[PDB]
Amino acid sequence: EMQLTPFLILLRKTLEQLQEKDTGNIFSEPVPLSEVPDYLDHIKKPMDFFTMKQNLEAYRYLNFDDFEEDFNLIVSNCLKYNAKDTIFYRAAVRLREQGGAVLRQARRQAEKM
Template sequence: MDELARAPRHGPHFNELRRFLNQIQNHKQAWTFLSPVNKDEVPDYYNVITSPMDLSAMEQRLGQDSYTAPKDLVANLTLIFSNCRPYNDATTVYAKCANKLEKYMWSLIKEIPEWFDLLEE
């Protein structure tokens, strides 16, 4: 039982991924991506976007250890942005938020030496 109690509850990258995701969630441009797109407000969204993603789903996946490496989490973040742009015109507040939040994401990645390999993708 002692071994079980000492075993880590999450994968090796959990804490750094949680910190990174929290920084993204707390950015002032993240508001539109915090929860899933509401089907009642945007009825055709799920007909157009076949792989929806939002920050609450990412938080849930992180808690379930679905992200085994930083690249997995970053892939879901970039999915959020790539979903937003084709659905929303570039002049909309949503597309502008996506652009600013993505720029912020890359600036955070540049501050983590262990994640530099993600910058080449």
């Protein structure tokens, strides 16, 4: 219920802030299915920040919830696949915490559009 171009500006900036939290660059490109062959036996919808960028620029996020849903998939897929005592699981918890705060801030800025 606002103009497209500003909303997308906000989502691009939000996506950059989320990517900045992935300091190890483990969430920034699809999981390499060539290196992890059992990945899709548990993960129904892989997600990553590059795919989110592509979706954003294809006009596939037209509300904040659709954007936040794909972010949440990045986190939940990693929590699902990895044991708790791993760097990967711990990284997803960190991203959930740090990324959640980025998202709330961005949602506020959207309410004003």
